[PDB]
């Protein structure tokens, strides 16, 4: 007799603990620079969520890199919202920043998030 | 002001972390359990285990790329828990369950030990 126990909130408990680690700056191994603002994070999480960061950290000449800059035209807010989303499953929006968020996700190669924003636009009002 | 809640996001993130694991990408440590070795990500181990939380929290054994456990810790029991860590699924056979609880106790995985207890009370 073989059996399997499926922990339905496990992935969520793991993601919460990873966010906690981020907030306490524990085991964080990279800083992302957007304009003059910095954001500490874990490459593995960034890679798991962004096709772009996946490439960057897959790139032998930019893998052991401890810092990463982005297009200077990428506003920090939109990016911060995406980073939070990555670590919480929650995408906090305002009618005033959804476009910047959608634009930023597309840049980060997060197509599913771009498409969800579209679905959101579609249902708004 | 709105908030879109991605109900399977955590699970998709966890799967992608297991993919990295299997493709040995960004893995940054090796857990040795007797002759057998296991490559993994420290953050994942920390998220799930108090022991590992304390180990990689220890400024000393914080940067080591290899950690050794008591040799009486059977690899199968450990591997089942490691899998669980990266997939949310715990595979149990009537013959290795007790071993698993015993192993999780070592790794400081109280909830998993308690779930197993709850399991035996029915099976």
């Amino acid at each position: 007799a073989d059996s399997q126990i499926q922990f339905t909130r496990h992935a969520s408990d793991v993601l919460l603990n990873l966010n906690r680690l981020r907030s306490r700056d524990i085991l964080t191994d990279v800083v992302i620079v957007v304009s003059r603002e910095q954001f500490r994070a874990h490459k593995t999480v960034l890679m798991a969520c962004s096709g772009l960061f996946y490439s960057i950290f897959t790139d032998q000449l930019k893998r052991n890199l401890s810092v990463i800059n982005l297009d200077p035209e990428i506003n920090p807010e939109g990016f911060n919202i995406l980073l939070d989303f990555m670590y919480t499953s929650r995408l906090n929006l305002r009618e005033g920043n959804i476009m910047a968020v959608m634009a930023t996700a597309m840049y980060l190669q997060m197509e599913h998030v771009v498409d969800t924003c579209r679905k959101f636009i579609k249902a708004s009002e | 002001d709105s908030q879109i809640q991605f109900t399977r996001h955590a699970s998709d993130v966890l799967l992608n972390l297991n993919r990295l694991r299997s493709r040995d990408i960004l893995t940054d440590v090796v857990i040795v359990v007797s002759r057998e070795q296991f490559r993994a990500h420290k953050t994942v181990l920390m998220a799930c285990s108090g022991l590992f939380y304390s180990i990689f929290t220890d400024q000393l054994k914080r940067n080591l790329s290899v950690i050794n456990l008591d040799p009486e810790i059977n690899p199968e029991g450990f591997n089942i828990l490691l899998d669980f860590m990266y997939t949310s699924r715990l595979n149990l056979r009537e013959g290795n369950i007790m071993a698993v609880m015993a192993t999780a106790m070592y790794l400081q995985m109280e909830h998993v030990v308690d779930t197993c207890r709850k399991f035996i009370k029915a099976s």
């Binding site: 997060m110 | 709105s2 908030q3 879109i4 991605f6 998709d12 993130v13 990295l20 299997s22």
Partner: peptide, 19 residues
Amino acid sequence: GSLVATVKEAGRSIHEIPR
């Protein structure tokens, strides 16, 4: 300020990293 409206997204949230 405002009371946040929430809605759920059930689909895949990010790319799927291949085996």
